[PDB]
Structure 1
């Protein structure tokens, strides 16, 4: 009676006067272990556990 689920979460980069917006991992001295799991683009890897 353990169940298994698939759920979705998302984000955006708005049209600025140049055009892009930032996406990275820099949140210094706020919860460092909750950062250790990321791409160059600030995104988790397919296959990694997260909680």
Structure 2
């Protein structure tokens, strides 16, 4: 019945983790920065500097 959906009787909180590493390279260094090429702004709204 929809009561279970509405009353949150059977609902689970699920958490995932996403690792990402910037490492040294012969090309130089990879930067964790907002200087991201060719991107819009509505998708840049929710990022810190």
Give the shorter-chain TM-score range: 0.3 to 0.5
Which structure shows the bigger proportion of residues in strand conformation? 2
Q: 1 or 2 for the larger relative contact order (CA 8 Å, sep ≥6)?
A: 1
Q: TM-score of the superposition, structure 1-length normalised?
A: 0.45
